[PDB]
RNA sequence: UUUUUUUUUUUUUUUUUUUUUUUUUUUUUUUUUUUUUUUUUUUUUUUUUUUUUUUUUUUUUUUUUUUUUUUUUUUUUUUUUUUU
């Protein structure tokens, strides 16, 4: 459900939203994993 | 035709209970660390006219039957007798 809502804000904030980081977006805050441990920690498994 | 029966007799106020006694702020975490150009191939080579047959020969008038012969009037019964 947070990644949904994720995915939203993403197409929310506009042509800005890859680079959220080099401009140091507080937005970008919520979209570090920590608010969604598990899933990630799942996707990093995967991942790996 | 008709012959019975066909008023009434109890009871019918009330007696409880009905306030309250707990809890009810807070103590975590919450940036990032990879990768992300390309390396082949990519014209064509065959074949592709034609050769047969394709008139006709039979039959195809007719021969029977086809009027008629019966029957076809009628002959019974057909008021009433209780009760109410």
Same mark, same amino acid.
């Given at each position: 459900n947070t990644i949904k809502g994720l995915m939203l804000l993403?197409?929310?904030? $506009? /042509?800005r939203? /890859?680079?959220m980081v080099l401009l140091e977006e507080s937005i970008?805050?919520?979209f570090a994993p920590? $608010?969604?441990p598990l899933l990630w920690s799942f996707a990093? $498994?995967?991942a790996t």
């Open positions: 993403y197409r929310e904030i $506009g /042509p939203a /890859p680079y970008q805050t919520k920590g $608010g969604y990093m $498994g995967v």
